[PDB]
Amino acid sequence: TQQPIVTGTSVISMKYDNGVIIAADNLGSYGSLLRFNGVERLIPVGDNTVVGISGDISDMQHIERLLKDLVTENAYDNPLADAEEALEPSYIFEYLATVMYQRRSKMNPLWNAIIVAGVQSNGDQFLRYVNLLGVTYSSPTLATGFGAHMANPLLRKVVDRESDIPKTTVQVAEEAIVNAMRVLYYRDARSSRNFSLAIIDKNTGLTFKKNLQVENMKWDFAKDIKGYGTQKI
């Protein structure tokens, strides 16, 4: 029994025809104080998986160490560690899900919501969610926090069921993701302008973009808004 101190807000993600995209901003809030500004919440694992984490940052940092120790452990007495016996996204997920549910069952949770995005060895897209209760689910789009409320509806307009995935390109998907990040910056009081984005493609591999910014913001209409009802000047 626990309470989150330093926290990260939404993590959003979707499948497209050849892969998966996932994004999360670079802020570590301390309640309403926007305390830390260069916080990386997407953590790559090998060249085929990105784990995106929201919630308590001390627990996120613990999960990083678990994942980086997992890579080390998997290389041990494994001559195929960078080939047929490399860590799959599904292996990494099941491990994290196992841990999350055990910790909730001991009444001492890791206060996080997690999305594991990647491509399996057979080229299949992987996207699955797990949180502090050990609840898990998969969907063509996935988001945590405010992301679930504001991103999912936007990303679902692009991919609304399984059959929309072959029809969606990496340019379309990234655009939808980048737009959702802007919306969250307008509307979520614990978001930041700066974010990271990662694409995991069955052909181009893992591309990891840092220091992105929300751009193309409409603020001009603000000049016309006066008072709260009757005030004219």
Partner: protein
């Protein structure tokens, strides 16, 4: 007497005969070596081909610890594995508490203290392996060799197993002829040669060669196995030298 029937008993000269008997098991094993180089270390070992039926390349004997340390050993293979498992737990616990990967001297004493602990009681048997290990840390490259007694030191080069003497002589020539240093790619070649030379003392069955290395410039300070073009290139340089 009967001073030699129980581990941890001092004989009247002040020896622990059970450890000395463990050394005999080590001398009976296949040859393995390490060469310290300019910015790294190289490990190699002789794998006797017992039969046609062994799958070539698929019975690996050099072992990684953490991401920056290689270990090879001669003697009872399972004992060596047990020691490396302990080394891995020790490395994880150091990294967990201190964040930085375990320094090689630090790692060497963890293995040493653990091996030495198995000479303290009559309820355990000493380790039947000598272990050559090392890698690269913030202070450079380090090579170590560790005996069943728990004795270890830092080495310029080291060898153990049946061909330890032939290898030792071969290593000594390199240390005399290269007081400025040996390069990593150079050391890989020499390693192949010495394993081939040292295979003289064990020539019933023919053998499969296995090499690994850590170099600040050639492997980025990580432990990797030498395979493919670089392996065959060094097998050939060895072939050339026995003829």
């Amino acid at each position: 007497t009967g001073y030699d029937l129980s581990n941890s008993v001092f004989s009247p000269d002040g020896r622990n005969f059970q450890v000395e008997y463990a050394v005999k098991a080590v001398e009976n094993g296949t040859t393995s070596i390490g060469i310290k180089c300019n910015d790294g270390v190289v490990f190699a070992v002789e794998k006797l081909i017992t039969s046609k039926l062994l799958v070539p390349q698929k019975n690996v004997k050099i072992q990684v610890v953490d991401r920056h340390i290689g270990c090879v050993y001669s003697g009872l293979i399972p004992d060596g594995r047990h020691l490396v498992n302990r080394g891995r737990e020790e490395a994880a616990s150091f990294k967990k508490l201190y964040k930085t990967p375990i320094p090689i001297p630090a790692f060497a004493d963890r293995l040493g203290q653990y091996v030495q602990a198995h000479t303290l009681y009559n309820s355990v048997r000493p380790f039947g392996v000598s272990t050559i290990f090392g890698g690269v840390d913030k202070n450079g490259a380090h090579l170590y060799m560790l005996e069943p007694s728990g004795s270890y030191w830092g080495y310029k080069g080291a060898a153990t197993g049946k061909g330890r003497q032939s290898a030792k002589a071969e290593l000594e020539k390199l240390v005399d002829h290269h007081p400025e240093g040996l390069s990593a790619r150079e050391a890989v070649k020499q390693a192949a040669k010495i394993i081939y030379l040292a295979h003289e003392d064990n020539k019933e069955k023919d053998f499969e060669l296995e090499i690994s290395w850590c170099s600040l410039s050639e492997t980025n300070g990580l432990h990797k196995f030498v395979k493919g073009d670089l392996l065959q290139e060094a097998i050939d340089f060895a072939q050339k030298e026995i003829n």
